[PDB]
Nucleic acid binder design. Structure first.
Length: 125
RNA sequence: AUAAACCGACGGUAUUGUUCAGAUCCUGGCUUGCCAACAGGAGUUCCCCGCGAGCGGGG
């Protein structure tokens, strides 16, 4: 990578270009090893999305109807519908599992990282 | 001056040792190469000399 790739893609990042980085890192990438974790599907998980003629149609076409939604994660009673950031990961060795819930699972980001202070008016790298 | 540019897939290695291809076997029997023949035939032979139809001496 250091040999074959262009430098300076990481100088400066933005609201979008960063948020996307964070989500992508949490779900679709396996970094960084060494006592970090990747969740929940695993590492290198693959996505499958139905596509439409327009982003609008597309984003909806992959939304889950309330009952189809209800069938998969209904149990609810042991719900947590609170993101890692709203309510934190319960520290170490837990276990509990299977009670992740409708929301807290999809936005499950276990990177456990504090994004540095924002800066500047200039181009996104 | 192009997912380009700058850019080794690199180094070390016996395929080795033992081994008759052997013993037996007629290619045998029958045929013609015969008939005719003066080695005929024809003096051009190119140049110099000497003595006269020709004769010598020279290349």
């Amino acid at each position: 990578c250091a040999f074959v790739n262009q430098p300076g893609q990481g100088e400066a990042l933005c609201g979008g270009c960063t948020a996307i980085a964070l989500f992508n890192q949490a779900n679709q990438a396996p970094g960084f090893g060494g006592g970090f974790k990747s969740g929940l599907r695993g590492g290198t998980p693959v996505t499958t999305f139905v596509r439409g003629i327009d982003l609008r149609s597309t984003v909806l076409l992959n939304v889950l109807t309330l009952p189809r939604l209800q069938k998969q994660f209904p149990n609810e009673s042991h719900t947590e519908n609170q993101p890692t950031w709203i309510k934190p990961i319960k520290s170490n060795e837990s276990i509990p599992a299977s009670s992740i819930g409708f929301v807290r699972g999809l936005f499950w980001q276990p990177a456990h990282i504090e994004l540095c202070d924002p800066i500047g008016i200039g181009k996104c790298s």
